[PDB]
Amino acid sequence: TSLPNYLAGNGDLGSWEPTQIFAGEADIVTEGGAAGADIEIYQVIAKNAAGAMVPHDPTAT
Amino acid sequence: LYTTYQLLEVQRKLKTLPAFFLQWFPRQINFQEDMIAFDKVIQDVTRV
Numbered sequence: 001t002s003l004p005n006y007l008a009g010n011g012d013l014g015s016w017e018p019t020q021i022f023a024g025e026a027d028i029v030t031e032g033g034a035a036g037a038d039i040e041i042y043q044v045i046a047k048n049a050a051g052a053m054v055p056h057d058p059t060a061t
Numbered sequence: 062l063y064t065t066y067q068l069l070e071v072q073r074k075l076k077t078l079p080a081f082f083l084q085w086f087p088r089q090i091n092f093q094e095d096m097i098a099f100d101k102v103i104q105d106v107t108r109v
Contacts, residue, residue, distance in 0.1 A: 004095075011096065
């Protein structure tokens with residue numbers, strides 16, 4: 001990155017979106033727990049047999 | 062010899078290209094920056 005662009009042109013800078021989470025007025029309960037797999041942001045979690053935090057997936061044996 | 066003459070007192074107007082499309086571009090911004098950022102916000106509130 002050394003030389004400026006003397007010419008003309010366009011540049012797309014990006015597109016923001018709001019990410020609303022809440023739909024009601026109930027109270028909020030939070031807790032910390034150790035994770036066992038990789039967990040994304042606002043992802044539904046469960047607990048495996050070890051007491052860790054595996055993200056949610058039905059049809060399991 | 063020759064024939065004397067006399068000119069006209071007529072100035073010069075140019076009539077270059079009339080500003081027909083600049084009636085739709087009213088605003089003017091000068092800027093010492095590099096680029097100009099714009100916004101594309103949806104202005105419509107058309108829902109009950």
